[PDB]
Amino acid sequence: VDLGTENLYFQLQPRRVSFRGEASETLQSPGYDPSRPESFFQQSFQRLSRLGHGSYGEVFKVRSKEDGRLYAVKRSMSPFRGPKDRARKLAEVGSHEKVGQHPCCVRLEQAWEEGGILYLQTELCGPSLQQHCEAWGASLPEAQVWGYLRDTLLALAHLHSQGLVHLDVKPANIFLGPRGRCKLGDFGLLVELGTAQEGDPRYMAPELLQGSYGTAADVFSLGLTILEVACNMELPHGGEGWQQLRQGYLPPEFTAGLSSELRSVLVMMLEPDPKLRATAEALLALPVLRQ
Numbered sequence: 584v585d586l587g588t589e590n591l592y593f594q595l596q597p598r599r600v601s602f603r604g605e606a607s608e609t610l611q612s613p614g615y616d617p618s619r620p621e622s623f624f625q626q627s628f629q630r631l632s633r634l635g636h637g638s639y640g641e642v643f644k645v646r647s648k649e650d651g652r653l654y655a656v657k658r659s660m661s662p663f664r665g666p667k668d669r670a671r672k673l674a675e676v677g678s679h680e681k682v683g684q685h686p687c688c689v690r691l692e693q694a695w696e697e698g699g700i701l702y703l704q705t706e707l708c709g710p711s712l713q714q715h716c717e718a719w720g721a722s723l724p725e726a727q728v729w730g731y732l733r734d735t736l737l738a739l740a741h742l743h744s745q746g747l748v749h750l751d752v753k754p755a756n757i758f759l760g761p762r763g764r765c766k767l768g769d770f771g772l773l774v775e776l777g778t779a780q781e782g783d784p785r786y787m788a789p790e791l792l793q794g795s796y797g798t799a800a801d802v803f804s805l806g807l808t809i810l811e812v813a814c815n816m817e818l819p820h821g822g823e824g825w826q827q828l829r830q831g832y833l834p835p836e837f838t839a840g841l842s843s844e845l846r847s848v849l850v851m852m853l854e855p856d857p858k859l860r861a862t863a864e865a866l867l868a869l870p871v872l873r874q
């Protein structure tokens with residue numbers, strides 16, 4: 584109703600977080616007894632390794648005591664600051680669910696809050712596309728690039744058909760599947776056009792400087808994502824180089840080795856004018872991007 588004015592503006596029992604509807608907020612698991620002081624997360628999972636960390640919190644590789652299967656769990660660092668912070672963190676679950684089952688989107692298994700900490704349990708993926716390129720140590724071969732471009736386009740087509748904008752497409756937010764596949768993840772910044780925060784400046788669509796939000800923004804971000812991985816090219820967060828990449832410039836020092844076909848597709852994705860920029864649907868229809 585109105586975030587920032589709540590009665591009791593100022594929970595040691597876990598509560599399921601869902602905007603889908605199931606009615607059962609109560610969590611249970613083998614290995615979990617709510618009368619013991621450890622959290623649901625502590626009692627219900629074997630934490631195997633830390634996959635990542637930052638200001639947001641941490642991600643663990645875990646084995647579920649429920650099914651013996653491997654998952655990734657992301658947890659927030661600190662208790663919610665208050666109801667706006669809580670509403671903003673929970674909105675990730677709403678967005679993640681709103682996305683849905685799509686094979687090119689990271690699948691959310693369940694989410695819960697406890698002690699003001701938010702936990703999201705997803706499928707365990709492979710490394711991020713950024714981590715993949717770091718391990719590769721060079722430009723990805725185009726055969727790999729075509730598969731990751733297709734997969735991430737399928738993911739964007741799925742979001743965009745539903746009026747959803749990811750707003751933070753980049754190698755760090757794309758995760759390897761088996762067999763040269765990948766999945767779009769990190770729906771924390773996703774917005775629903777015409778309803779109710781900024782992506783990585785290196786990948787940001789030029790029209791966002793004027794607050795012009797649209798699905799086209801994601802196509803531009805994926806353009807620079809693919810340019811980066813295909814050319815092993817570090818993207819500037821600002822200055823002349825940042826501007827040039829938003830004026831149709833492809834640096835010849837990095838891009839001379841691109842196939843005409845991959846170059847042509849990147850030019851359509853990097854079109855500065857969001858009204859002229861190709862849609863994900865339009866790109867997936869091109870014979871060069873089928874099967």
Ligand SMILES: Cc1ccc(O)c(C)c1-n1c(N)c(C(=O)N2CCn3nccc3C2)c2nc(C)c(C)nc21
Pocket residue numbers: 634635636642655656657689703704705706707708709710711714758767768769770
């Ligand atoms: C948990 C979570 C909730 C929401 C959501 O949108 C996403 C995408 C995730 N999510 C995974 N599924 C990760 C993962 O599965 N891995 C990648 C890192 N990595 N390294 C080796 C294997 C892996 C396997 C993962 N990793 C990190 C560092 C972050 C920040 N989130 C990740």
